[PDB]
Amino acid sequence: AELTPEVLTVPLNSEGKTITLTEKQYLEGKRLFQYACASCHVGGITKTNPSLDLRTETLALATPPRDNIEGLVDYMKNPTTYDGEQEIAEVHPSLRSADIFPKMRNLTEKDLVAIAGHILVEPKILGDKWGGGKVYY
Amino acid sequence: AIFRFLLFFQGFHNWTLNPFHMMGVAGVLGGALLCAIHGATVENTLFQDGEGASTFRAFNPTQAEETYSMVTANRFWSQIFGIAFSNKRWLHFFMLFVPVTGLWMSAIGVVGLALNLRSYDFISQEIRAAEDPEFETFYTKNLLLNEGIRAWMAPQDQPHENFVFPEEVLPRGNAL
Amino acid sequence: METLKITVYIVVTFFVLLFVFGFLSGDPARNPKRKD
Amino acid sequence: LNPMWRQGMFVLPFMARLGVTGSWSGWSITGETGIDPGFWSFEGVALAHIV
Amino acid sequence: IPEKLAFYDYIGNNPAKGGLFRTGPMNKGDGIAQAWKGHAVFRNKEGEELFVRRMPAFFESFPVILTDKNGVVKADIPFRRAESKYSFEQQGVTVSFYGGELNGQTFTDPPTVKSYARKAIFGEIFEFDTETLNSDGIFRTSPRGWFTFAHA
Amino acid sequence: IPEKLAFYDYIGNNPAKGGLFRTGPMNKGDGIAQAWKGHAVFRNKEGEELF
């Protein structure tokens, strides 16, 4: 098996347009996800709130849907709760709160696409392991 | 892979509870103790047989004379520990005997485990614990650990069995 | 309990004083070769 | 209905006879609970004999 | 199906299910077998035949998992109840008996059904006399096991 | 009538009722006493009390 363009193709938006990441973007995405996110989101769970994971199915039922590049890029700029009702930049890393979350300072627009891309690709590779937790280690 | 072997034997065979392993443990730990205590006694009851601060040079393989004082070693250990060796031949035979016997004992226990002839349980404990939900011992706590080991490692450790354990059957304590 | 506490405080102090003053009583001299 | 002599107790009565009536676990053979017998409980007498 | 053949198809006669200090005859453990209860057939509420996964000899304890002919899990007895998907209660598992003492009988009350599922991991299901020898319910090995051990 | 007093008026507590190899506490024989059943009064059909 290998990292093919099929696996590297992911929804860009809710319209149903798609984008094909390069292998480079994917690995950039993975590296930046480790740098900025994995302390809480290792393996696609959320250590400080396990009820909410990074599975595609969960992101799809979020409000604004977050199962696409645009929704996830937006989330990293202006995070909301799962029903969209409340903004949580003060307790969740975002560019909006890069002053209190200093690792977000040096993230460019293309870094965000790469991180979002990693999050949408990884469950295509790992299946249940992504977001499933220790049961699947 | 050997580390996995050890853990397998804990969870499936409860091998730590097996008195043949226990005798093996005593024999290996007892051998190591004998090894350290004999080497240190000799090295700390040496006779002054040269002028150097490096006492190694003052031994000649063809000298007939003992190089350390059995008598002072015997006094030391009698007064420190109550008992000491007094017979050098017995001492060194005992050093052969202890770890050789311990290893032989453990081999016997493993033969039994070839047949799943384990020392897995104490029946008296299980009868009481079944009836009395407030009865708890380190023996019942370790069996819960075994039960976790088996359910959590079997699917991947025994792939030919095609074990599919859904999340809802995995034994788990609270939160973890 | 306070009586037990006091008793143990006294007993421990006793043994520790014995230890300290015993080693201060010329202990290097108490060997079989050279004494001072 | 279940006093010491129904239970095959043989030395317990000789301690009770001369004034030892209570256990460090808080019962006495007269049925009063929460007594504090001090050292000279049934247990203290036994320990003393062992020592 | 002769009872003698059914009784061979039961893990309690497997000699690798004993223990070193579990002494005496096999009868002292599971009891004196009296009768084959019959062959248990499990079905869910949709009528698929389900199959209890049998205990392997390696395991002192084993969970209760039911499969379809294809090996797909369709029911179990859950440990954690809050997120259970496959409970007997949810799947409407039932058991029917063909042959033996319970032939032609069907049970639907989930606790009875789970009870036979717990026995089906051992193979075929027998009625035992546990009183006569005050059997403790824990498997012992057979003369085949004791002889091999001693001679090895 | 206090139970304790009824219990003394019972042959199972008489020390001359035993056996040399009948071992153990008295409770191993008749059992652990739990309760006075009450005093039994026997009458015949003429209502005369019998003993």
Place this chain on the structure above:
Amino acid sequence: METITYVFIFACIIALFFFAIFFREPPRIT
């Protein structure tokens, strides 16, 4: 009965320690 047995064996071992130390065969030089 099992408790009595365990403690009896333990006490016999302690007693053996006592004889083994104070009533040993004395080591004697040559």
Place this chain on the structure above:
Amino acid sequence: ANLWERFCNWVTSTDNRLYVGWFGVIMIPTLLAATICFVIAFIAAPPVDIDGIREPVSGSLLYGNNIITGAVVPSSNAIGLHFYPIWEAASLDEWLYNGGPYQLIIFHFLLGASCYMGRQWELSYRLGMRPWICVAYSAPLASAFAVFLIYPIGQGSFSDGMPLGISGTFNFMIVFQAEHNILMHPFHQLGVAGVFGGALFCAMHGSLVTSSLIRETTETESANYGYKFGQEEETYNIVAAHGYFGRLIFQYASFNNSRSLHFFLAAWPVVGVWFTALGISTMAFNLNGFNFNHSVIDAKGNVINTWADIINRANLGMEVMHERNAHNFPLDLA
């Protein structure tokens, strides 16, 4: 000839059947306290709430244990690292429920055993010996500190120190493997090399010396009677032993110097056990064994399991089961 100097002379006398010494003045009462409390607790102590969750664990023989399952149970997690002497309890009943006897035993024992080590120095000095037998005993002593004191310090509670029991010991080492993975830690691997190699060299030395005993007896008598306590001459032929072992392997892998040989005997297990005691003492601060979980993946990114991942599955089973009612939150951080 004053009262003190007479006392000092009895304390340090080399005529006492058992040497007392100044370290003995502390060792004797502390060991007697630890021993007497240990025997009584093991036989008769009531159940102890080791994990502070009002779930008492029965450890003594009278409350339904045998020799293998019995233990003196560690003190309550509610106490953590607080000092819990008797006089701090409202009653002995309280002290027993919360695990007081454990603290009394381990503190007296560690004190007594530290003094045991010093007493080995002291008597060596009084007898005009070289001094370092006590350094060999520092390896076991360090190991006892690690499981009774250092590990409880790092984790925050004497409730995670090793139980004073046989099955309690096993519980301790199983839960240690799930929380630390001692097996994949190199200091434990060196401890194994220290005790396996220690047993090996014990057998080797014993068999080589026993192999080369000089004929001094008939076949109707124990060959041990060919050695007399205090004889000046060696009782075996080291050149014959060396001539055998150097041919078994090759010449230069065999000792011809008995002093180097016995130093090696001393050094290998002592040093290996130093490392394993330091393993426990550093996993006390959660610097754990190697983690190669999901380290191998394929071109696509699928995880390719190794035997380390199989170890991880077993560790997970120990983790999720231990102290099954004691965790309310997802991470078992101590």
Place this chain on the structure above:
Amino acid sequence: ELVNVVDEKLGTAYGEKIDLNNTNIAAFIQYRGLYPTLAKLIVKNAPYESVEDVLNIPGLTERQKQILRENLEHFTVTEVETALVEGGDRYNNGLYK
């Protein structure tokens, strides 16, 4: 007559839908728009006699009422089960991942 009441409850609608009187709050993530805000409101205002009662929760906006309407078929109500609602278990039932 000795029955496990949680297992019994799995044989009701509680075993197939979100039970507004008993189910832990994390189940409301299964449907969009429900967590955390409406889920918090629903759990605080239980018990309910019928699934439709949820629409009378004081405070709902029209958007909230419409979200509930879209999801009424995913809900049920059964009798409150003490074992499921004591201990604050509707907010944290000790299950994480």
Place this chain on the structure above:
Amino acid sequence: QTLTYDDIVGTGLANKCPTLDDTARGAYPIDSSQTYRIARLCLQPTTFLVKEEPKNKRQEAEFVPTKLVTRETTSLDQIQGELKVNSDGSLTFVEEDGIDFQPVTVQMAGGERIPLLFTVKNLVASTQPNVTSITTSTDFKGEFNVPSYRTANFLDPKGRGLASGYDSAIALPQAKEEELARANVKRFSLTKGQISLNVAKVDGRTGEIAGTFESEQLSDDDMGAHEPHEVKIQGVFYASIEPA
């Protein structure tokens, strides 16, 4: 003076309710118009009594004293609730929230440990009619809920539980289950307790009241494994009243 944490810590004072000066014999008047809350109710047990079992014919056993073995972990505090005025002048406290339970285990003579959940959960307690003033003769009397001492995830030592755990004695694979049913099937009890609160001190200025309490409730039944004991608890209380 008001103490700080570092004054209190390690002393035992954290487990004690506030007291009032013995000078505090006033009265706190109630406006049937106005609404009120209790901003803090504190209950400090001092004595745990357990009903013995007389065994013989109907002798009706006594309440015997016990020793506390779980230390200074016993007090309920920071309890709050509505204080309502009813048509007939009675006042009713309705508990809303607070640290309103503590597990406790006391030890009887002979060594039996008795765990209990000391609680006032869901307390509703009410005065006589025609109060109009809270005074040093005012009594509140009420009832509260006693949930199971362990909740549903609790696993016994063989792994059996109610919402989690094994449903059988797995260590006895072929034993007859009938005898084990009581140990195997966990049940969640919910019983009621009764409390009386007696007001003996009142600070008319500050809305603080204090006095004595006695409650009666059931002990732990180990999820149905055994019959509970009756427990009687006595102690002191403190409560602070506020107009809402």
Place this chain on the structure above:
Amino acid sequence: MEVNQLGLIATALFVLVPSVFLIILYVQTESQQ
């Protein structure tokens, strides 16, 4: 506890029989000397 009743005689002879054997050999060794 419901222990094996025969464990007691098993343990008793396991201690007694080899111990007696040693004592017999010891005592007749002393009375040679």
Place this chain on the structure above:
Amino acid sequence: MEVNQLGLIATALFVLVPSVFLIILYVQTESQ
């Protein structure tokens, strides 16, 4: 038959202990 189970150990020790005593005294007589 419902016999007393301490009967077995009581009979075994009643035989063993005094028998062993005599055997000890006899063997050490022969070797002297």
